[PDB]
Structure formats: structure tokens, C-alpha cells
Symmetry: C3
Subunit: 140 residues, 3 copies
């Protein structure tokens, strides 16, 4: 998790050099300019170090929130896997059930046709029988 110490800037405990206080007769000129320039530059690098700290810190907070989002996505994916596999099972079951039901209805129609033929035949024979009855009754 993001490290808050990166949010603490360094405050410069030194005071911006006054060019009155440097030793007069002991230093060369070039070295004087060197000390002053080094002071200013120390200030600047301090600033850069602080800003860098803040950049890395923000990178870390972003990484943390993205870690939460990644875990969430992972979980969602896993739930979705359970659901999809269950769905696979139930789909297969439904397809097989449809096919089996189809062979059953096929057999049913097969029986229906024969029943139709039989009922027609019985109808004809019954008609002939009725005619014979009427004929036998016609005489006495």
C-alpha cells in the first residue's frame, strides 16, 4: 500500500547565503562563486527530490486503487465462470432432453397413423355389417 513518507517534503534548514558573511581574504573568487552556486543548487535539487517523492507517491496510490479494481474484476470473472459452466451443463441436458422427447413424439405419431388406419378399416367393416343387418331385417 502507498507509502505516506513520500508526502513529507524536506524543508531546507539552511538559510539562503548572504555574500557578506563568507570569509574575505581566505577564499579565492572562483571558490566563492562555487559556494554560492552550490547553495542555490542544493535548494533546487531539494525541490526536485520533493516533487519526485510526490510523483512516486501518486504512482503508488494509483497502483493501490488499481489493485482493488483488479481483484474485483478477478472475482467477477470467477463468478462468471461458475455460471457459464453451470449453463453448459444445463444446456447439454436440455439438448439431450429435446432429442429424446423427439424420438418419443416420433413413436407417438407412428402409433397414431396405424390407429387411424385401423379405425378406418373398422369403419368400413361396420358399414358392411350394418348393411347386412338391414338386409336380413328387410325380410321378416
Amino acid at each position: 500500500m502507498a507509502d505516506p513518507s513520500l508526502n513529507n517534503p524536506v524543508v531546507i534548514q539552511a538559510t539562503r547565503l548572504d555574500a557578506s558573511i563568507l570569509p574575505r581574504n581566505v577564499f579565492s573568487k572562483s571558490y566563492l562563486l562555487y559556494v554560492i552556486a552550490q547553495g542555490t543548487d542544493v535548494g533546487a535539487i531539494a525541490g526536485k527530490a520533493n516533487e519526485a517523492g510526490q510523483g512516486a507517491y501518486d504512482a503508488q496510490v494509483k497502483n493501490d486503487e488499481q489493485d482493488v479494481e483488479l481483484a474485483d474484476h478477478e472475482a467477477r470473472i470467477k463468478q462468471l465462470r461458475i455460471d457459464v459452466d453451470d449453463h453448459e451443463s444445463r444446456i447439454t441436458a436440455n439438448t439431450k432432453a429435446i432429442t429424446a422427447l423427439n424420438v418419443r413424439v416420433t413413436t407417438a405419431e407412428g402409433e397414431i397413423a396405424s390407429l387411424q388406419t385401423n379405425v378406418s378399416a373398422l369403419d368400413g367393416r361396420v358399414t358392411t355389417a350394418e348393411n347386412n343387418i338391414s338386409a336380413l331385417q328387410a325380410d321378416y
Copy 2:
């Protein structure tokens, strides 16, 4: 892409400063105090730069692991997409199959009904015919 150099701190100086090693009849008060706090400040900025660098490094490592996790999530998600599309196909197929089977069962039942009514007709006419036969046989 990860830079290990960000995890390598710069080691400053060699020897620490107390005003012992300082000349100190040559330096004024303000400049003496300036040398010391500046020493302290250089130490502090070294520390801040190092910690910031390390923080950025850790941010990069986290970026790497998150990249791996992102790739994993990508593969898993795309596969789930293909699977879900397959499920869509089979579901549609099953719905259409059910629709096709239902009208089939309907016509089968309609024909069963017609066969029922016809059978009832035959069963009445057959009963009446039996009555006529029995009457013809009775007289006699």
C-alpha cells in the same frame, strides 16, 4: 520495462562533520552555521532522493505484476466471450427446437382427439348393431 537503477541509492561523502575539523578562526558565525546546516541538508536531500527513487521502483514492479494480472484477465475474459457466444447459439437452437416440437405435440393430440370421437362413434354403432343382431337371434 523496469529500471533496477532506481533501487540503487547514492552513497554520500565519507566522513561526517562536527565543527572540529573546521578551521574556525577563519570562518564567521553565520558562515560556520551555514556550513553545518548545509551538511545536514545534503544528508537529508540524499535520503529524500534515495527514498523517492525506491518508491518509483516499487511502483514499477507493481506495474509489472499488474501487467501480468491484466494479461491473465484478458485471456480469461476473451475465452468467456467465446463460450458465451456458443451458449447463445445452443440456447437459440433449443428454443427453436422446443417451438418445433410443441406444434408437433399439438397436431398429435388433435389427431388423438379425432380418433377418440371416431372410436366413440364406432362403439355406439357397434352397440346398436349388436342390439339388432341379438333381436334377430331372439326371434327365432
Copy 3:
């Protein structure tokens, strides 16, 4: 969003130290070695701070790209989630339809069976009728 200012290095006006610019008889050995070491090392700290800044920047841009990919993952996951829920619904519906169709077909077959028994009985009765009629003209 990524801050490009982290890629802007501090340029240190001081390029440290020469044996020409330094005072001589005034400094102690330890203090001289301290000045030299301080010169080289402060520069080094500048370099490290700059490098750290660059690292933080790279971390931020990488975070941005990962944000785009994460958003993509979010959208895809939620969409496939609703789709999977839809599949759950229609699968359940299909299972219920299959069960209902099965309940219909069982009863239909039962009715077919009853029809077969009835048509067989009618067949026998019609045969008996044929024999009785045939017998009735047989004796005339």
C-alpha cells in the same frame, strides 16, 4: 493523468571543484576531503533526484494506459455478466418448457394406449358380429 514536469531535470550550475579554486593552508585534511566528497556527491544526488522524477513519470503514464485497459475490462465484464444472466433466464425457461412438454407427451401416450385397448375390444366385438351375421344367413 501523467505529469511531464517530472521529466524536467535540474541542471546544476556547479561542476564540482578544482585544485585551482580551493584555499590551501586554511583547511584541515578531513575538511578538504569533505569539500571534495561533498562536491561530487551533491551532484550525484542531483542526478538521482532527476532519475527518480523520470521514474515516477513513467509510472504515471503506465498507470494511464493500464487505466484504459482496465476500463475496457470493466465494460466487457459487465456486459458479459448481463448476457450470462439472460442466458440463465432463457435456459430456465427452456427447461420448464421441456418438462411441460414431457408431461403433455406422457398423458398423450396414455390416451393412445386407451385408444389401442378400445380399438382392440371393438375389433373383437366386430369379429363376433361378423360371425353372428354370417351364422344368421347360414341358417335361413
